[PDB]
Amino acid sequence: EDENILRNAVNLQVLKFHYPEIESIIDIASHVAVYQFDVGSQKWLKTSIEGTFFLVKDQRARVGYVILNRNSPENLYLFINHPSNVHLVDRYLIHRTENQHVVGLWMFDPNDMSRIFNIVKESLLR
């Protein structure tokens, strides 16, 4: 347990370095791949973003997530603005930002997927 504590303290500072508005880590999942829906072609594309997923909250307690990319300096930090914008479909978390902007997340471990989904919904529960 103690090695994980230090690891989360280090991860949070890596996060704050790229994204100083991040206040804390809610939860984590390893080996997440990111896809984008090209509706100008009706095709999913796999992005170059794969790495550790961090569900985080703002200093204003807005909920979002970061994927620290294991391939490049280009990470991804997105907000989850409305809980109904996130759907568990098949093996994927589908995240729709209003006006037809859709990303999809694949978590290596199926248990991370349904756990993170619940934590996302409960984090926004009001």
Partner: peptide
């Protein structure tokens, strides 16, 4: 309102937007 080593992008379900 919609409806419908890492996997190939072709495996993801297709979102459909309604009007």
């Amino acid at each position: 309102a919609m409806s419908f080593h890492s996997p190939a992008a072709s495996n993801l379900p297709i979102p459909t937007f309604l009007h």
